[PDB]
Each structure stands twice: as C-alpha cells, then as structure tokens.
Design an enzyme around this catalytic site. Structure first.
Site, PDB file in Angstrom:
ATOM      1  CD  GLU A  59      -2.359   1.391   2.772  1.00  0.00           C
ATOM      2  OE1 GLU A  59      -2.739   0.323   3.295  1.00  0.00           O
ATOM      3  OE2 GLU A  59      -2.553   2.510   3.293  1.00  0.00           O
ATOM      4  CD  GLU A 136       2.493   3.565  10.327  1.00  0.00           C
ATOM      5  OE1 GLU A 136       3.421   2.759  10.553  1.00  0.00           O
ATOM      6  OE2 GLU A 136       1.286   3.257  10.414  1.00  0.00           O
TER       7      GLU A 136
END
Lengths: 414, 53
Positions: A59, A136
C-alpha cells in the site's frame, strides 16, 4: 414515499464476471462525479509471520511507481485530473480507489490497472518506504485507541493469523525484501479475488469495457479460535485509561449480525468519558463488544455499567428499546450509504464479503424481523456467560481482574 | 468391653460418622482444590513483560 417505499428507488448495482474472474460492479446515478476502485480479498490474516507487513508495504509503495509511468508521473496524472487516489488495508481487505469526475472515468480505471497488475518496486523507493514506515510506527504509538484494538486482536486470536497487526512488527518490515513483496503480489493480487467497483456517474457497460481493456490481463489462474485472554499495558503516566472488551462474534455470513447491531445500538457515558460499542466482523469470527476511555479512578464503575447493560439486554430486553435500536440502525445504514465513496466501498466490501450486493430492502426486512425476544435470545447466545477478551492500555489498576470481569458476564439473579 | 461401652456409648455412632466424613472429605478436598487451581490458574500462568521506551 414511505421509508420502505423509498428504498425501492435505490438503483441496483449491476455485476458482471470477466473471463479472468474479475468481478465488475457498478451503481449508476445522476452524479457529476464518481469513485472507481479495486477491492482485493487479501489482508493481514492471509500473511504468515515471514511477511506480516507485506500488504501495508505494498500500500505504501503502490502509488510510488509503475512500469508504464514513474511514480512522479503517476502522481502528476492523478493531480492534473483533479482526482484523489486513496488506499486502505484491513486484516481481510485491501482497496485502492480513485475518486474523480464522471468524464475522467476512462483514465482512472486504466490507472487502477496500472497500479494493480504492473507495480514497479524500485529498490530505492523500497528503502524510502522502509524509513517512512519506521517513522510511522512511532507516529502510531501516540494513538491509544489503535494500540488498544491491536492489543485486543492479539489477545483474542493469539495463535491465529487474524491476531497479527496490519502494519506488522518493526523487525519484519525492516527485513522485508523486495522478492517477498513480489511473491505476495503474485500469490495474492489475482482474479477472481478482485472486484472493480464504481458508483455515481458511471454507466455499467462503460466500466465493463474499461475493465476488460485494462484489468483484463490479470492472471486467470488455519482454524480461527477465539481465546478469552487479556493484555494489560500500564504506563501509568498516561492521562486516561483505555479499555476494550469483546466476545467472539459471528462472521460476515450470519443472520445474527443484524440483531447484534440492534443490541449495540441499544447500548450512559456519564460514568465514562467516551464509550462506544463495536461489532467488528470477519469471515468466520468477529469481535463484538465495547471500548471506552476512563478516569484513573473510574474504570471499575464503567465496566460494571457496561456489563450490566449487556446482562439486561441478554435477560430482559423490552420492546421499546429494541424498536429504538432498530430505528437507530436503519438511520445509520441509510446515512452511511450517502455519498459516492461510501457506496463504492460498500459495493466492493459486500462483493468480497457476501458475494453479492445486499439491497436496502433486504436490510430493512431483516431489521423488521428483529424482535425483543430475538434480541434476548441472540444476546444470550453470544454475550451471556462467555469468556471475554480484554485489552487495557493504562493507567489500568482499578480495572477488575480477569476473574472479576468474567464473573460479571453472568447474573446470579437470572 | 462393657466398661468401654459405658465410657463411650457413642462408639459405634462415632465410628460410623467418622467413616462417612472420611468419604465426604475424600470427595470434597480434591474438588475444592481443583476449584482453587481453576480460579488461580489465571495468575499462576500469566506472563509479564517489561518494555521501557
């Protein structure tokens, strides 16, 4: 124009099956803009420990480059048309959707094909995505709710692929090689596991033609157990306590889902801070329960109130409350389906989940079937006297011990 | 024998109740111990980890 009468006005979602197996679905409407997308029945639950973070990495790098056009070129083409591309990955689904104008449909679908079939996995881009995901991780560390729900999944499913996080471990993403991503793409991104869903200003035959032109080259060719455990991370310096308690729920294919939704809608935040009820559904299992934030000194009272509400629903549920829950569920369904992106997501997820797009008339008939007796029976079937899975991100000290929580799942009076 | 009976007229009844309570304890003690082990297994088997930042 009664509610039941009004549901019939909803246009049907035409579905076609391509030669390679890709399922093309559309919901035409008099809308100036549309949101095309590709939904794939691949998620974290289909990944082993070797490649737990494969889908999330894909992704990340999906819009960073393809063979036909470099990532900069792809992004510029998206931006110039005014469209917004987006992607998400759950433990069971993976979606890439381009939201654009009705006249921009021919390009957008091509774009999706370019993203899906031939994805350019540049090594430098892969290392950049490694760094981005590593950052992240710390970014996500702040979000208490996401950590709590990850804890809940991990403790509830434990020795099951359904328990590993979508992002995956830091070590796994660190050592996840390009060949692993390519193998994941080859073994997972294949028809007929794909639904090209679009709604709004899209004519179904146009979408079918675009899919055959672009998405036509796609290659044609463990027992999930719910363990009622608990996880308890304390970190007493955090301001408020986060807790999520759940029990095993039915899969996607089960009539009891609607009754459970009504029961959840039936379920006093005065004792709490922000208490919510969730009914996460998977293929064969699910997490039905609640999640709330607490003061350091009020976890026990909120847990008592929540479990008391559960017991009241399981044992004695009046008709007025069930009618209120049914009305709430109907309003939530219809309001959620407003918007082009919501209907496209619903079409894709329904095709990947039910094998069909269940119309609103069927939903409303099913809700009408629901009764107070049905609510009590199904709640007792799934909630009453069941070993729960608890996840608590601190400060948890007043959270009752697991024996107390379990004993609170049944009533001595009943 | 008669003097022993006079001293302990409850001898036979005491023996009978002793046998009955021996059987009762043989039934109960393992069961209550199993109940305690079942209730305490959560603590007896729980694992804890320390994860400093």
């Amino acid at each position: 124009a009664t509610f039941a009468q009004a549901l019939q006005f909803v246009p049907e979602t035409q579905v076609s099956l391509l030669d390679n197996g890709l399922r093309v679905a559309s919901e035409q409407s008099s809308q100036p803009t549309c949101t095309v997308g590709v939904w794939i029945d691949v998620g974290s639950r289909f990944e082993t420990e070797k490649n737990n973070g494969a889908g999330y990495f894909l992704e990340h790098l999906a819009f960073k480059g393809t063979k036909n056009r470099p990532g900069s070129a792809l992004e510029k083409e998206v931006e110039s048309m005014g469209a917004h591309l987006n992607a998400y990955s759950t433990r069971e689904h993976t979606a890439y959707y381009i939201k654009a104008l009705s006249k921009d449909l021919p390009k957008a679908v091509e774009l999706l094909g370019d993203i899906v079939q031939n994805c350019s996995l540049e090594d430098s881009q892969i290392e950049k995505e490694r760094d981005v995901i590593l950052r992240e991780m710390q970014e996500n560390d702040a979000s208490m709710r996401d950590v709590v729900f990850n804890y809940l999944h991990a403790t509830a499913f434990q020795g099951t692929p359904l328990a590993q996080a979508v992002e995956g471990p830091s070590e796994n993403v660190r050592k996840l090689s390009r060949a692993d991503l390519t193998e994941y793409l080859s073994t997972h991104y294949k028809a007929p596991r794909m639904v090209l869903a679009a709604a709004g200003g899209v004519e179904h035959q146009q979408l079918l033609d675009l899919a055959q032109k672009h998405l036509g080259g796609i290659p044609w060719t463990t027992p999930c157990r719910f363990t009622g455990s608990e996880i308890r991370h304390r970190d007493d310096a955090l301001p408020f306590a986060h807790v999520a308690i759940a029990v095993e729920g039915p899969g996607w294919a089960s009539p009891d889902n609607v009754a459970l939704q009504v029961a959840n809608a039936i379920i006093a935040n005065k004792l709490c801070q922000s208490f919510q009820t969730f009914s996460i559904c998977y293929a064969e299992t699910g997490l039905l329960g609640a999640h709330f934030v607490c003061d350091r000194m009020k976890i026990d009272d909120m847990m008592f109130v929540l479990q008391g509400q559960w017991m009241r629903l399981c044992t004695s549920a009046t008709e007025s409350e069930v009618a209120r829950g049914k009305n709430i569920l109907r309003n939530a369904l219809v309001s959620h389906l407003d918007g082009t992106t919501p209907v496209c997501e619903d079409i894709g997820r329904s095709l990947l989940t039910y094998g069909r797009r269940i119309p609103l008339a069927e939903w409303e008939s099913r809700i009408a079937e629901v009764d107070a007796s049905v609510v009590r029976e199904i709640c007792s079937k799934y909630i009453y006297d069941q070993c729960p899975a608890v996840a608590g991100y601190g400060p948890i000290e007043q959270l009752p011990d697991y024996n107390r929580i379990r004993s609170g799942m049944f009533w001595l009076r009943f | 024998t008669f003097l022993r009976w006079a001293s302990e007229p409850e001898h036979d009844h005491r023996k009978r109740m002793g046998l009955k309570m021996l059987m009762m304890m043989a039934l109960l003690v393992p069961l209550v111990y199993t109940i305690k082990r079942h209730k305490w297994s959560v603590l007896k088997s729980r694992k804890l980890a320390y994860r400093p930042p």
